[PDB]
Amino acid sequence: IPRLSKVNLFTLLSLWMELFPAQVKRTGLVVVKNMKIVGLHCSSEDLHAGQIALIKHGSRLKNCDLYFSRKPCSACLKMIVNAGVNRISYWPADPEISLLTSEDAKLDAKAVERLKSNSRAHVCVLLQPLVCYMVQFVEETSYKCDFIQKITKTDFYYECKQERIKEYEMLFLVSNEEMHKQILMTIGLENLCENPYFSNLRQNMKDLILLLATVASSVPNFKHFGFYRSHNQSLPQEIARHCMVQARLLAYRTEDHKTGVGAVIWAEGKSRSCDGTGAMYFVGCGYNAFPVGSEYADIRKFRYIIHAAQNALTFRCQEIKPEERSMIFVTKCPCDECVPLIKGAGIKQIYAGDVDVGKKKADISYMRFGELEGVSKFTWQLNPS
Amino acid sequence: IPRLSKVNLFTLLSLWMELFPAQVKRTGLVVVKNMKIVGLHCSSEDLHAGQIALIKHGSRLKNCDLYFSRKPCSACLKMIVNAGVNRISYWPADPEISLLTSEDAKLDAKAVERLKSNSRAHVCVLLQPLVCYMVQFVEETSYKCDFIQKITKTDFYYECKQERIKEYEMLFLVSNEEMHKQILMTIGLENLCENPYFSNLRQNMKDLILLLATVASSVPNFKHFGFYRSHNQSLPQEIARHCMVQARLLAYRTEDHKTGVGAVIWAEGKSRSCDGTGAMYFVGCGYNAFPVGSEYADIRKFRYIIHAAQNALTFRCQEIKPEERSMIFVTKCPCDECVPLIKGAGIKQIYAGDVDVGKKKADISYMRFGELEGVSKFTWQLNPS
Amino acid sequence: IPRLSKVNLFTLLSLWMELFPAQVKRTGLVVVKNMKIVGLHCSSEDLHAGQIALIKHGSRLKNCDLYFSRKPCSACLKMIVNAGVNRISYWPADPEISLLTSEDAKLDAKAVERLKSNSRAHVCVLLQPLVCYMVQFVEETSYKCDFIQKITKTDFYYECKQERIKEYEMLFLVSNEEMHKQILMTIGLENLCENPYFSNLRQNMKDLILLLATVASSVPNFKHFGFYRSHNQSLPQEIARHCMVQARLLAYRTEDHKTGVGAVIWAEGKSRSCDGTGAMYFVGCGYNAFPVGSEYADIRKFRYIIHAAQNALTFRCQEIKPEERSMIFVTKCPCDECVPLIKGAGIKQIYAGDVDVGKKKADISYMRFGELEGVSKFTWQLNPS
Ligand SMILES: [Zn+2]
Ligand SMILES: [Zn+2]
Ligand SMILES: [Zn+2]
Ligand SMILES: [Zn+2]
Ligand SMILES: [Zn+2]
Ligand SMILES: [Zn+2]
């Protein structure tokens, strides 16, 4: 199956992070250490994503890859190059200080360019063209996902996808080519305004937004559908849908199996936070893959697949606090091998699609999820109220 | 004096961890990083030791040495090689999925062997023969230890040692040579099924169990003897004895001084835990040794000895939580130089053998232990009740 | 402007840490890792600074630079070379075990020298001479600092400076040359007892104490002046003055800008601690500088300055606990881009000199500090009571 590019996932997550429910525009930020996600941040009303990551990580930002949905300002860029980040990837549409409003906006962008010149860190654009079948593969698997088939069992998806397309190009894309060229002049991307580089960048950006709208619509705000019980209190539906699209994006990094499963872990601290996500903070993410260092990565072969929940718990940037409410979002029903790990790790809530619940396959089982105690299970369904 | 090897200590601690008081058999696990113990785990009713270590450490298992009392199954092995462990050492008697019950047990064992082929991590048997005088040295020093002499001052030890030999041979050894050969073939140890390698492995296994039964009997469940006050509530006697044997095993890594002292630090979390040890979790361990990076390691020379308690507090894998109940188990009375460190570190309880309490020797003193306030002191003695 | 060197700052901070308000003399200790301060410790009634740092850091002392205000004893030195420190710097005066009282004191010093010979770590005197204009620059800028100018608005400073010179010379310097030679004879500094090395060491020692007495007097205990509101409860005035002199010393590491700003972050844990500072523990420190790894460090150029508060929050050795009271001490009023960072980081209290509060300069503003909510602001002023 086609696999989402590893830097394209980080670019897509930063765009999705900007859409996290809550002159200067909101920015999503993905912090990546050792090519593993260690931070998912969004701008707040008071602080920018780059300044939030400095508070959250500080000197731990050393040798980290930062993926911005908007080019960071001079104040943000100086603080992260001071922290020691190596790569700063940004989505080249409109920076933090909007250029579509200003003399100050151009001045700040000009100061960013000369800060980049006099610095070791690399401020660049790391979005890649997708595989020829990648968009169609995501579009087909978004029909077949748990959350869309659940609604079907009880045409709508295509309508929902089209509205997300119009909304997301309105936010992440500059429709007017002349405005985009002026932005690329201002943010030091002069090499990308000459064809075919201008058209290639614009088509690559539109392809990534089309894929993002496809994935976001696969967990849609359709009717009263949401995550309900089937602490014990559920997350807000807008937040729960957002974290499931995160896990769904992670599910497209799977290439070792025919079906991609994605998992993301989020926790809610019992205190005020500076992040735009609020008390919500990222814990860990993972997808279905083979063990790192194994020959499979380079009886059925599925037995050695590391599941999405296992990878999320393995490469976690934060510890699970017993006092805090922690959530794991799995694109499928957690299996008989993953449920004990989730309960053992202390995760309070499970948000998953229970299409395969109670099923016993040849090499995987989903029997322990139905009879799970001590962990709140929220599944995609109509509101019981 | 004869010194226990590091791998032999780690192998013995994994066997001892399986005996931690609480088709698939229980497994003890020792996690070692940079030749320092960072985790002492045992299998629980719900999770295996390998799965527990993934929850406890996760990506921190990278380049960690894992010592299993039983060969881990395919689910455990794939997760730890995915985590990044380099060397997996197991006791070659009976794996997690018991082969003495099965087609599934053999099938899982065969799947483990081709993970070892298709992976970077090393699944080996780091078991070594003991020194010629090591067993006799341990047996002699077990007479002279504080806990045996405390009972003597108030023939029994040899009887206690003999029962542990029968019990531990029945648990960690395959007495029948034919079943042991079948296990070794099934777990990919065909090179150890031919003499003299078969006899050498079995004799070395029996030597390690005989030493383990000697050490375990030195802190015996004899009469009403235990650790009593002489938070503030004591540990369960079975747990306290187990942690003292851990420290006693660490005491045999000492070679810089004629007398070996061992210390281990354990704490109780105020929440549910997935480990087979329950809320108990390992904090740090150490023994009497010279400073690392000194000519002594490679004015009396004892004043340069780093004591067991100091080494335990130095190379601690966990921080001491003020809200938690933390315990240190010292094979002897803590000295006037270690008691301030234990109190300063915030350790709530001290379990020790106070044979030398109130004594002023040349390079060591034991006056501050008797007059210590703010720390609970539990010593080996008869129950005052 | 003249700039204080790193080793001289660490040496001066260790001497200042000895003066932290609360046979064997009190010792201040600075723990430095990767040229960043990760620990500010002082001796307590029960424990020494070297033993406290072992409790505070343990194995994290590996490859750490330890700066002592007095030469550590044999017990302290063995534990820190065992922990793995790569360099021990001490103030070449009366050591931890005072030699001005003793056969035991001389015996311990001989044991320290023998341990140093048979060990990898370097026990040295990293004291350096100051720049020719360094003392006069500090003396001039101490007139112009916020705290001295605040009192002037509401001759006194020179009198206060002279008493600190007499007090600090009596504490950190050996006035008699004969006793100082005997100390240097005993502590293995035989090469510093011959002129001009003896006179160079003594003159450099007196120069550092004169600079320290100049910085300390710039935040003096003059009349009722202190830090008052203008949790919510203020620190003790002696503690607050001490931490601001720490930040003021950090302000003299600034050379990128004509005016030096320093910031230090301290937190108070809600539990007993072994340190001589009590529940107070060091969090982070910083000064005004250009980003690390930038051409500026090796559109106005001040826009790229990393402020003292931003550097303190970036290179912090501890996290800001929401339940704890955390304090930041800034030598000047925090600017409009540092106040959001301080509030975002969760720092409860700000101690600063609000000379520039409410001022709007070309490239810096101080408008958000006056209208700050949720953070306690304590400024240098007379007691309102
Ligand atoms: Zn910004
Ligand atoms: Zn699974
Ligand atoms: Zn297993
Ligand atoms: Zn001791
Ligand atoms: Zn000392
Ligand atoms: Zn500032």
Numbering used by the authors:
A (entry chain C), B (entry chain B), C (entry chain A): 30 to 51, 84 to 162, 167 to 219, 226 to 301, 310 to 377, 390 to 476
Text from the published report:
We collected datasets of the CDADC1 E400A variant alone, in the presence of dCTP (“good” substrate), and in the presence of 5mdCTP (“bad” substrate). All three datasets were analyzed imposing either C3 (trimer) or D3 (dimer of trimers, hexamer) symmetry. CDADC1 trimers are closed rings formed by three protomers assembled in a head-to-tail orientation. The majority of the contacts are formed between Nα2 and Nα3 from the NTD of one protomer and Cα2 and Cα3 of the CTD of the other. In addition, the structured portion of the loop 367–396 (369–375 and 391–396) near the CTD active site forms contacts with both Nα3 and Nα4 from the NTD. This results in the vast interface of ~1,100 Å2 between the two adjacent protomers, according to the PISA server. In our structures, the side chain of E400 is missing, because the residue was mutated to alanine to prevent catalysis. The trimer maps in the ligand binding region and the trimer conformation suggested a ligand-free state of the trimer, irrespective of whether or not dCTP or 5mdCTP was present in the sample. There is no evidence for ligand binding in the maps of the CTD active sites, and no significant structural changes seem to occur, suggesting that trimers do not bind dCTP or 5mdCTP.
Vertebrates possess a second DCTD-like protein, CDADC1 (NYD-SP15). Unlike DCTD, CDADC1 contains two CMP/dCMP-like deaminase domains (IPR002125), connected by a long (>100 residues) linker within a single polypeptide chain, resulting in CDADC1 being approximately triple the length of DCTD (e.g. 514 residues in human CDADC1 versus 178 in human DCTD). The C-terminal deaminase domain (CTD) of CDADC1 contains a potentially active HAE motif, but its N-terminal domain (NTD) appears to be naturally inactivated due to the mutation of the proton shuttle glutamate (the HAG motif instead of HAE), suggesting noncatalytic function. In this work, we provide biochemical and structural evidence that human CDADC1 deaminates dCTP and CTP.
